[PDB]
Write a protein that holds these residues in place. Sequence first.
Motif, PDB file in Angstrom:
ATOM      1  N   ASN A 107      35.642  44.016  16.897  1.00 19.88           N
ATOM      2  CA  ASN A 107      36.626  42.972  16.653  1.00 19.88           C
ATOM      3  C   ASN A 107      38.062  43.489  16.681  1.00 19.88           C
ATOM      4  O   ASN A 107      38.989  42.680  16.711  1.00 19.88           O
TER       5      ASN A 107
ATOM      6  N   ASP B 258      40.483  31.202  21.095  1.00 20.51           N
ATOM      7  CA  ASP B 258      40.960  31.995  19.969  1.00 20.51           C
ATOM      8  C   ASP B 258      40.379  33.401  20.049  1.00 20.51           C
ATOM      9  O   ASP B 258      39.177  33.597  19.862  1.00 20.51           O
ATOM     10  N   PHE B 262      39.954  37.744  12.733  1.00 19.83           N
ATOM     11  CA  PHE B 262      39.326  37.152  11.552  1.00 19.83           C
ATOM     12  C   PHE B 262      38.439  35.972  11.930  1.00 19.83           C
ATOM     13  O   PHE B 262      37.323  35.838  11.422  1.00 19.83           O
ATOM     14  N   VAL B 263      38.949  35.084  12.790  1.00 14.31           N
ATOM     15  CA  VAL B 263      38.206  33.911  13.248  1.00 14.31           C
ATOM     16  C   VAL B 263      36.919  34.329  13.956  1.00 14.31           C
ATOM     17  O   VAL B 263      35.840  33.775  13.710  1.00 14.31           O
ATOM     18  N   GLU B 265      34.988  36.703  13.557  1.00 17.63           N
ATOM     19  CA  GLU B 265      33.897  37.261  12.765  1.00 17.63           C
ATOM     20  C   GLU B 265      32.724  36.294  12.602  1.00 17.63           C
ATOM     21  O   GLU B 265      31.638  36.743  12.228  1.00 17.63           O
ATOM     22  N   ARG B 285      30.014  20.987   8.620  1.00 17.67           N
ATOM     23  CA  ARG B 285      31.462  21.077   8.460  1.00 17.67           C
ATOM     24  C   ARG B 285      32.002  22.376   9.044  1.00 17.67           C
ATOM     25  O   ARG B 285      33.070  22.393   9.669  1.00 17.67           O
ATOM     26  N   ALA B 289      35.014  22.932  11.964  1.00 17.81           N
ATOM     27  CA  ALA B 289      36.165  23.786  11.698  1.00 17.81           C
ATOM     28  C   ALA B 289      36.019  25.110  12.440  1.00 17.81           C
ATOM     29  O   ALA B 289      36.159  25.150  13.668  1.00 17.81           O
ATOM     30  N   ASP B 290      35.697  26.178  11.693  1.00 18.39           N
ATOM     31  CA  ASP B 290      35.499  27.556  12.159  1.00 18.39           C
ATOM     32  C   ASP B 290      36.134  27.838  13.514  1.00 18.39           C
ATOM     33  O   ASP B 290      37.124  28.571  13.585  1.00 18.39           O
TER      34      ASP B 290
ATOM     35  N   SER C 252      39.160  29.561   5.898  1.00 21.29           N
ATOM     36  CA  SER C 252      38.195  30.648   5.990  1.00 21.29           C
ATOM     37  C   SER C 252      38.774  31.886   6.650  1.00 21.29           C
ATOM     38  O   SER C 252      38.225  32.981   6.481  1.00 21.29           O
ATOM     39  N   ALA C 253      39.880  31.746   7.369  1.00 17.80           N
ATOM     40  CA  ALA C 253      40.449  32.865   8.097  1.00 17.80           C
ATOM     41  C   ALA C 253      41.881  32.534   8.457  1.00 17.80           C
ATOM     42  O   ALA C 253      42.240  31.369   8.638  1.00 17.80           O
ATOM     43  N   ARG C 255      44.579  31.981  11.042  1.00 17.26           N
ATOM     44  CA  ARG C 255      44.391  31.430  12.381  1.00 17.26           C
ATOM     45  C   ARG C 255      45.615  31.638  13.269  1.00 17.26           C
ATOM     46  O   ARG C 255      46.753  31.616  12.795  1.00 17.26           O
ATOM     47  N   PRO C 256      45.401  31.839  14.566  1.00 18.25           N
ATOM     48  CA  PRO C 256      46.504  32.208  15.452  1.00 18.25           C
ATOM     49  C   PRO C 256      47.334  31.016  15.877  1.00 18.25           C
ATOM     50  O   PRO C 256      46.864  29.879  15.941  1.00 18.25           O
ATOM     51  N   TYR C 307      44.725  42.769  10.436  1.00 23.88           N
ATOM     52  CA  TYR C 307      43.321  43.100  10.633  1.00 23.88           C
ATOM     53  C   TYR C 307      43.128  44.599  10.845  1.00 23.88           C
ATOM     54  O   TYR C 307      42.200  45.200  10.295  1.00 23.88           O
TER      55      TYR C 307
END
Lengths: 446, 448, 455, 448
Positions: A107, B258, B262-263, B265, B285, B289-290, C252-253, C255-256, C307
Motif C-alpha cells: 500500500n 482512489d 488508507f482507503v 486498505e 452501508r 461508502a468505503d 473510516s479513512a 480521503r483524497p 501514511y
Amino acid sequence: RLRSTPQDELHDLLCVGFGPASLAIAIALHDALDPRLNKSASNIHAQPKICFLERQKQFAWHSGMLVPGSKAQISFIKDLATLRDPRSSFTFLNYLHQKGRLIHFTNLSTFLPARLEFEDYMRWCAQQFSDVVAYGEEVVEVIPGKSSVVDFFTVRSRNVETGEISARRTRKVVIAIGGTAKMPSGLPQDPRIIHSSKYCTTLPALLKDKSKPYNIAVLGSGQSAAEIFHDLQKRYPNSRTTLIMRDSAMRPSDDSPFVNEIFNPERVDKFYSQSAAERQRSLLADKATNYSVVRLELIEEIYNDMYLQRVKNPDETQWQHRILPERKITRVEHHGPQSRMRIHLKSSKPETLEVDALMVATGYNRNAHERLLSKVQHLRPTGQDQWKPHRDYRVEMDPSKVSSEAGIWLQGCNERTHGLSDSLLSVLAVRGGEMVQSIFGEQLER
Amino acid sequence: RLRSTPQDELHDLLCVGFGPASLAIAIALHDALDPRLNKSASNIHAQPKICFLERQKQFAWHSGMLVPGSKAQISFIKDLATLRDPRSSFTFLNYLHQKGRLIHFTNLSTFLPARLEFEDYMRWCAQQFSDVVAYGEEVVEVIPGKSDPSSSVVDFFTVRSRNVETGEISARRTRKVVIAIGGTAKMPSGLPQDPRIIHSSKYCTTLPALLKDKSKPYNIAVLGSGQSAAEIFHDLQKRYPNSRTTLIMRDSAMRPSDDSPFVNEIFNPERVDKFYSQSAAERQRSLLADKATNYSVVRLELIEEIYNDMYLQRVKNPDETQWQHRILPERKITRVEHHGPQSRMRIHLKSSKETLEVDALMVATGYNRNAHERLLSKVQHLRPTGQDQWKPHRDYRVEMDPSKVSSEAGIWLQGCNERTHGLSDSLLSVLAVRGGEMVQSIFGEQLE
Amino acid sequence: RLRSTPQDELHDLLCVGFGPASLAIAIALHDALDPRLNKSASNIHAQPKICFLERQKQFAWHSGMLVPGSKAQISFIKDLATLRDPRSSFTFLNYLHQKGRLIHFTNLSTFLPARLEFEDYMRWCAQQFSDVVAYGEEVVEVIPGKSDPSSSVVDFFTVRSRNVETGEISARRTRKVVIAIGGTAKMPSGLPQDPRIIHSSKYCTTLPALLKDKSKPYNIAVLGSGQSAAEIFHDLQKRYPNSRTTLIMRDSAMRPSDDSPFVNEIFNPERVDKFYSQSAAERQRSLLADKATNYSVVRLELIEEIYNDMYLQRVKNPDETQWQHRILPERKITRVEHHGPQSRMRIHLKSSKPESDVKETLEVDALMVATGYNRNAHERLLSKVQHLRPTGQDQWKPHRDYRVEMDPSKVSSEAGIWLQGCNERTHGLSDSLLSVLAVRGGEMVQSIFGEQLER
Amino acid sequence: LRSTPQDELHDLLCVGFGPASLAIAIALHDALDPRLNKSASNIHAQPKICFLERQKQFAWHSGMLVPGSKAQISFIKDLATLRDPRSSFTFLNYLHQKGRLIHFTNLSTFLPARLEFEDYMRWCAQQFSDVVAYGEEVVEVIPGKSDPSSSVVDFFTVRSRNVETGEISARRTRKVVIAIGGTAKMPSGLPQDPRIIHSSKYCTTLPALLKDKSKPYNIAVLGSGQSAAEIFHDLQKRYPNSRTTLIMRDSAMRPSDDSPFVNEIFNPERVDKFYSQSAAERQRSLLADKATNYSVVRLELIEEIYNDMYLQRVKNPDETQWQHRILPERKITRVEHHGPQSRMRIHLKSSKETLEVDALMVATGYNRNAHERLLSKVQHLRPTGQDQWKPHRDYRVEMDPSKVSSEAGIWLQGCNERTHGLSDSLLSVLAVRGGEMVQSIFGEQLER
Ligand SMILES: Cc1cc2nc3c(=O)[nH]c(=O)nc-3n(C[C@H](O)[C@H](O)[C@H](O)COP(=O)(O)OP(=O)(O)OC[C@H]3O[C@@H](n4cnc5c(N)ncnc54)[C@H](O)[C@@H]3O)c2cc1C
Ligand SMILES: Cc1cc2nc3c(=O)[nH]c(=O)nc-3n(C[C@H](O)[C@H](O)[C@H](O)COP(=O)(O)OP(=O)(O)OC[C@H]3O[C@@H](n4cnc5c(N)ncnc54)[C@H](O)[C@@H]3O)c2cc1C
Ligand SMILES: Cc1cc2nc3c(=O)[nH]c(=O)nc-3n(C[C@H](O)[C@H](O)[C@H](O)COP(=O)(O)OP(=O)(O)OC[C@H]3O[C@@H](n4cnc5c(N)ncnc54)[C@H](O)[C@@H]3O)c2cc1C
Ligand SMILES: Cc1cc2nc3c(=O)[nH]c(=O)nc-3n(C[C@H](O)[C@H](O)[C@H](O)COP(=O)(O)OP(=O)(O)OC[C@H]3O[C@@H](n4cnc5c(N)ncnc54)[C@H](O)[C@@H]3O)c2cc1C
Ligand SMILES: [Ca+2]
Ligand SMILES: [Ca+2]
C-alpha cells in the motif's frame, strides 16, 4: 543452517567484513546448498568451512546516515537474493511476509524502502548466519601461508572488546570492507569536524540542545551532503546551516531507464571487457548516477525551502539556510577556548564562516584492502603495484608463487574494472551467486 | 505435476472456470503439495482428483479488453501467489525471472504491468496445470447425485458441460464443486439486441469483425463512464483515426479511481475477516461508502490523457459541437432505432436528471455476478429450509441442509460474494491468500 | 488609486470584511476604472464612494493555518484577477515580477504556491487599497435608513462597527452593502470552554504559546479528517518531536481530493450559471455528488506522507497501540472533560457507526478541532433589516448576481445588500473558495456600479 | 505598428520572423503603449520597422510539429511575461482571448503542446502583419552612404530573394537585426540524397518520400537528442509496419536536466554574469553547466520509448527480432546510395554492421553561423583585424567608428551562445531580451 567451523581449523573461505557484500555471499551459499533451489544440491552432504569476521558488534548498515525519512536509493527488487532467485527465502518480499508487513508495504506504492527498513531486512537475513559470523573482530592483516608455494592465508583480527589478536587459516579470502571516510587533506582533526558516516551517531552528542541557534556548515554536494543539509534544518530549527560545494549547483541523479541499465547485473560483463581507456571514459559519461549527485525529489525540496526564505527576505546572503557554490575551504581556525571554528572560503574557479560544527560529506576511499594485503602483495605477478581483479573478482597471483587452490577475492572496491554498480546494492544478489560458483563451484560438484 | 484424473471417474473437486480465481486455487494446491514450500508435505503420497472446466479454448484474461497500452489496475505484488508465499514459483517476479525479463521490468519503475504482460504471466502459470484443465467446456448445469438413491443424502454432484466446438454435452462426477465463473455482461434493459450493440467484454474480438476498415469514418458511440468505457473511448480514437466517437454517460464526469493508501486498505486480505463478520446492515452501508464500486471509475492517468486529447480539439476548433470526439455527460439512451437496411442505428438521448446516428454502440456498463444461480438451479433445493439465495460461509462454502447433503460434499462460490466478503472479492486483490484458504477448506482434512 | 471617502459621507458601497472576496471586488473596481484595461473608462472622472471594514488589524488570510510547508489548494492562475483579465496589474505573476521573484517561482515548476506566499500576494494587493479599508473595525449591525422622514421607504443603510482596540462604535451610511465575512468556527456542541480546545482557525496563533517547550512529550489530539486536520496532525509531529498525537475521525479513512480535470470543471467560473439555474433539489443533489472536492478531503501527497510516517512506526513496532502517533477512525467524541488548567483534559471516544461498541479514552494537553466553518453570521448582522425581505422568506435569498431579494414596496432599488462567500447552496462549491473570485469580482462591480459607470 | 513604405529608409530591419524577432516586435509594441509605460504618452512618431521572413507565414519549426510533441519550456517563458506580465502578448492572455484560459488551467501543465505554443506565437505575429514581409529570404547586407563620397556608412541595404519568383528586392535601414535561428547541421560524412532528410524537414519532407503507410519501410534515425527521440517514437505510429532503427554515438538516450538549481543558468539575469566572464570561464562553463540544448530527451519521452521497447521484449526475448531497435555506441562510416535499388546501405562502426533503409532521418542539430554569409559584404566595417562578428552585451556588433555612423549598426540574436549563454538560442530569455533590444536600438529615439 550453516554450521560453524572451529577457529583453529583450516577454512575453505574467510570473508573480511559482514556488510551487504558478504551477506549476499552467505545467502547465495545458503541457496546453493538448499535442495529446493538447486536440485543438484540434494547429493551434497558436506558444507564448506566458511567464516565471516565483522568489526561491528552486530549487523549494521551505515548507521551514521540513518537520517529520518531516508530511503534506500534502490528498487527493492535489487535486494540480496531476488535477481538471482525470486524463490529465495532471503528476498525483501519474503522478509516483509515474515514480519506481517507485506500488504502494508504494498500500500506504500513505492519501490524504495526506508533505509531503516532495509537495514532491518538485512539484519533479519544476517541472523540466519549467526553461527558463522564472528562479530567484534577487526581484521588487521592477511599473511601468506606455505604447507615451496603459498597454499593458504592467515587472517589476523583484533577483538574489539579485549584488544586480543587471533589468527584464522583459510585457503581463500574475500575482502568486502566497504569504504573509509574520505576527508579533504586540508581539514584538521577536531570533534566539531565530523564526517557524514558519523552524522547520526556523533553530531547529537556534540550539539545537544536542538533549540539553540547553532551555525552548522556542510561540505559537499552529493546525496549525503544534501540529506545532512536538509536534515539539519529540521533537527535544529533555529540553526543557521550553510552548504559549501565546489560545483556550481547540486546536480540530479539520472533516473532514466536506458542510462540506469549500467546497473543491470549482466552489464558487469560489458563493462569489464572494455579497455582501461574505455572504462575510464565510460565512468565519466555516467557520473550523473554516482553518489556525487542528489535525488531529484530532494533537490526540489531543498530548492523549495530556499524559495520560501526568498519570500520573506529577498537578500539571499541574509538567509538562515544558504548554499555557497563554487567555494573551497582554504583555512580552518580551531584552537582556543572559543566554541566556534572559523572557516575561510575562497572561490574554487581558476569570506569566513563561524560554525559550531562542520559536517564533511565528501564520500569514501575504497583502498583499505591494500593495507590489509600488504604482506601478501609480493605474490602478485612481476611489476604489479596494484591488485588486479579478474572478472570473477579473484586477484591475479604469480602462479609459481601461489597454489591454484588458494586465492583472494575483492568485493566493493572494483569500480575501475567492474563499473559503478560494484560498490552498491545493485548487483549483490547475482554477484553473490557468481562468487559462490567461483570459490565453491568445484568443491560443490561432489 | 498435477496428474490428470479420468473424465468418468468420481472427482474430489471440480472447478467451473479457469480464470484467475481458479488458477490461484490450482497454484495454492500445487504449493501445498510442494515439500519444499510446506515441510509437512513430504509425507503426502496422494494427489487429489481435481479437474477444471473452462469455456475458452485456451487460457485468456478478458481478451475482449486487451486494448493496446492497457495496464493491470493492481500492484503486481498482488499476483496469484506472493501475498500467500513470496517463495512460490508462481510469483510474477519468478515468472519474469524465468523469461529473462526481471531486471528489464525493474527498470520500468512501475507496479502496474501491461494487461498483455499480466495475462502472459497467468498463461505461463496455467500451463503447469495443462493435464487437469479441460478447455472449451461450457458448464451448463450441476446435478445432485446420490450414491444411495433410496436415501435423502446427496453425496456427490454431476457437472454437465457443452463442448464449445462440438456442441456435445459431457458430464463429470465430483463430491465438491467450485463455481469461479466471473461475471456476465450487464446490459441496460432498454437496449435491443443488435450485432452493432456490443458489450465491452467483446470489444477487441467482435468490433473489428463488424467494423473491418480501420480508415473509414465510422460513428461509434460508447455507453458508460468507468475504466472500460474510458479505455474503449480512448482506444477507438487511435484504432479508427477518422471515426467520430461519442462517450455517453449518465454521470456528469469521468471520476478518478482512489489510489490513496488508507482507503485501499479495504482490499487487504486480512480485511475479509473484518468485513465478513460485520452485520448485513453494516456491510451494505460500508459498500456504499468505503469506495466507489470496482471498475466504475477511471485511472487518473487515463482521464488526464483523454482530457488532453479533448483540449487539443479545443485548440483547433473552439466549438465543442464540431469536435470529432465528444463526451455527452448526464445523458441516458431512451430509444434505439435499429431496423432497416441503413448500416447506422439512431440513438435517442435525454437528460439523466438530441439524436446520434452510429455504426456501433459499445456498452461498458459492467457485469452481473450471479450466473451461478442458473448453473446451480437443480441443486438449490438442498439449501437449508426457506433459503432463496446461496449463502457462503467465511470459507466460501455455501450453506447446505445437513440432513440432505453429506458433509463430504459441498459447493463453494468464488468471485461473486462482494456482499459478504467485500469489494476485493471479484478482483485479483486477495486471490493468492484466498487460494490457500480454499485449499485448506476443501482439502484440509484430506491432506492431514 | 482608489481615493478614500470621508467617513460620514453617504457611500455608494460599503463592504463588510476585507478578505479575498472583498479584495477581489476592490481589484475589479480598480480595473474597471483603469483606462488601460477598459477603454470606456477614460471618460470616467468620478470614482464611486467605496469603503471596506475589516475586523482584523491588517490584511491576513487564515493566519491560524499558515502551517510550515502548507500550499494553497489552488492553481495560481485562479488568483484575484487573471481569469477576469490576465493583463491586470493584480495578477499573481505580476506580483512575483514586482517582488523580483518571477523567474525563481518559475523554477519551482509548481502551480500551487505556499500559503505564506499566496497570503503575501493578497497582502500586496490589499496595500494598494489602504485608503479605503478601515482595519480593526468589527461590524456589529446593519440598520435601515430613511433619507425622507416624509416617506416610509428605506433608501440607505447605516453600518455600525465596534473598533476592536477602543470599543468605540462608529456608523457609516451607504446605499449598498456587501457582506463578505467568510465563516465562523464550527465547534462540536457540548465542548467545555477551555483555552486548550483550539479550532483549526486559531492553530498557529494559539497552540505554540500554550505548548511552549517544543521538546516536552505532550499528548495532542486532532479532531477531523479534512485538509486542515491532516495538516495539523502532520505538523504537530514535526513541531513537537516527542509528542504523542492522535487524529480522531468520524470517517473510516482519510480521503483524497479529486484532482481530475473533468470533475474539477465544477470550479470553472462559467459553471456558476449552470449551477445557479438548477432546481433546489438538483443543486442539493449535485452538492452531494461532489463532496470529495472541498476542505473535507486531503491532498493525496499529504495522505501519502502521513501514511508513510505511520508505516515507519510499523517497522519499529508491529503493535499499532504502542505507536507514538495514531489515527482512530470511525470514532466520535462523546465528552471532553477538564479539571482546570493544572490538569489534562480527558477525551471520551465512541464508535461513530449507527447505534447497534469498542470505545477509548485519551488524556491530552490540547485538542485541535478541525471541523470547518459555519457561514451564516450575516443573519445576526442583518437581523435589524430582515423585516425588509419579501413576505414569507425566513432566509436571505440571493439572486444570480448575489443581491438579496427585498420587498420593493419597503426598499428603494437604489439601495441593496449583496452576500459573498456564503452562497454554496445557490452558487456551488466554488462560492467560498478562491476559485471564481476574479470573475465574480467583475460581476459584482457590474451589478453594483454598472449603471453608475455608464454615466 | 504601422507599415513603412518598402522604399523608405527604415530605422530598423530584422532578418527572420521567428520567436527572437517576434519578441522584439512585442517589446517595441509594449514600449509604445502609454498604458504599459507612462513615458510613451508623449511619443507621437512610430519607429520605421520591418521584418523579413523566408517562410510564407509564421511557423515555428513546422518540420518538427510531430503529433503529441510538447514545448520544452514552461509557458511562463513566453514572449512577454518575464518582462511584463501585464502585456497583452502573454501566453495566458492569448488563452483568455481564445476562451481557453480555464480549460488550459485544468490541464495542470507548464508544457503546452508544440501545436498550441506555435498558435500562440502565430496569434502574436498576426498583430504585426503590416510590418512583416513573408516570402523573403535575405541573401546579403551591403554598405550604404547617404552621400556616396562620404567616408562613413550611415545605413545598410538589405537584399532579399522572393522565394516564389526569385526576384531580388532591396530595402534601406539604419539598423539591422539578424535573428535567423540555425541551419541544418549534417555530419560531414553523409552524401547528398533525397532519402537522407534532416529533422528540420521531417514532417514536411518525409511523408512525400514515403507515401505508403502500409509498406514495411526500414527507416533509420541518426541522433540521441530530443528530435531524434520524437522522430523515432513518431515513426513507429506513422508507419506501423515499418522497422525503425535509432543510431546514436552515446551509450544511451539521456534525460533533460529539469532540476531547479542547474536550470538557473537559463534565468534572464544570468546573461549579465555570463557575458562579463572571461573567454576561458565561459568556454568552461558551457561544457560544465549543462548538456547542450536539445541534445538530451525529456524524461517522459524516454520512458515512453523504453516502455514500448519492453513490450517488444514481452512479445519476443530476441532483441534482434524487434521491429524497432536502438543501436547505441555507433557511427555511420559509409552510405551506399547509387544503383537501381530504392534502399541505401548504411555501414556502422563502433563510435568508441549494415542496415538497408528506405530513408535516413538525421537529427543532429543546427549550425548558427549563417549570419557570416549574410554579412560578408559589410565585414570590412569591423574593427581592424577582426575575422568574426563580436557582439557587445546589448547584442550590437563592434564596428570601426571611423567607418560606421553611430546612428547605424547591426545586432545579432540567437547565435551568441558563446558570449551570452546556452539560453541565447532558446525561448528562455526572449521576453527580457526583447525589452533590452528595444532600449538598445530605440532608446534615444524613445526619449526624443
Ligand atoms: C547513506 C549511504 C551512503 C553511501 N555512500 C556511498 C558512496 O559515497 N559511494 C559509493 O560508491 N557507495 C555508497 N553507498 C552504497 C554502499 O556502499 C552500499 O549500500 C553497501 O553498503 C555496500 O556494501 P559493502 O558490504 O561492499 O560495504 P559496507 O556496507 O560498507 O560493508 C562493509 C563492512 O565491512 C566491515 N569492515 C570494514 N573494515 C573491517 C575490518 N578491518 N575488519 C572487519 N570488518 C570490517 C564494516 O564494519 C562493514 O560492516 C552508500 C550507501 C548509503 C546507505
Ligand atoms: C478489462 C477488465 C475489466 C474488468 N471489469 C470488472 C468489473 O466491471 N467489475 C469487477 O468487480 N471486476 C472487474 N475486473 C476485475 C476482474 O474480475 C479480475 O481481474 C479477475 O478477472 C477475476 O477473476 P475471476 O477468475 O473471479 O473471473 P474471470 O477472470 O472472469 O474468470 C472467469 C472464468 O470462468 C470462465 N467461465 C465463465 N462461465 C463459465 C461456464 N459456464 N463454464 C465454464 N467456464 C466458464 C470464463 O471463461 C473465465 O475464464 C475487470 C478486469 C479487467 C482486466
Ligand atoms: C487553511 C484554510 C482553510 C480553509 N477552510 C475552508 C473550509 O472549511 N470550507 C470552505 O468552504 N472554505 C475554506 N477555505 C477557503 C477560504 O474560504 C478561501 O480561501 C477564502 O479565504 C475565502 O475568502 P472570503 O473573503 O469569502 O473569507 P475569509 O477569507 O474568511 O474572509 C472574511 C473576512 O471578513 C472578516 N470579517 C469577519 N467578520 C467581520 C465583521 N463582523 N466585521 C468586519 N470584518 C469581518 C474576517 O476578518 C476576514 O478577513 C480555507 C482556506 C484555507 C487557506
Ligand atoms: C523542434 C525544435 C528543435 C530545436 N532544436 C534546437 C537545437 O538543436 N539547439 C538549440 O540551441 N535550440 C533548439 N530549439 C529551440 C529554438 O531555437 C527556439 O525554440 C526558437 O525557435 C528560437 O527562435 P529564433 O527566432 O532565434 O530562431 P527560429 O525559431 O529559428 O527562427 C528563425 C527564423 O528566421 C527565418 N530565416 C532564416 N534565415 C533567413 C533568411 N536568410 N531570410 C529571412 N528569414 C530567414 C527562419 O525561417 C525562421 O523563421 C529547437 C526548438 C524546436 C521546436
Ligand atoms: Ca497508492
Ligand atoms: Ca523543474
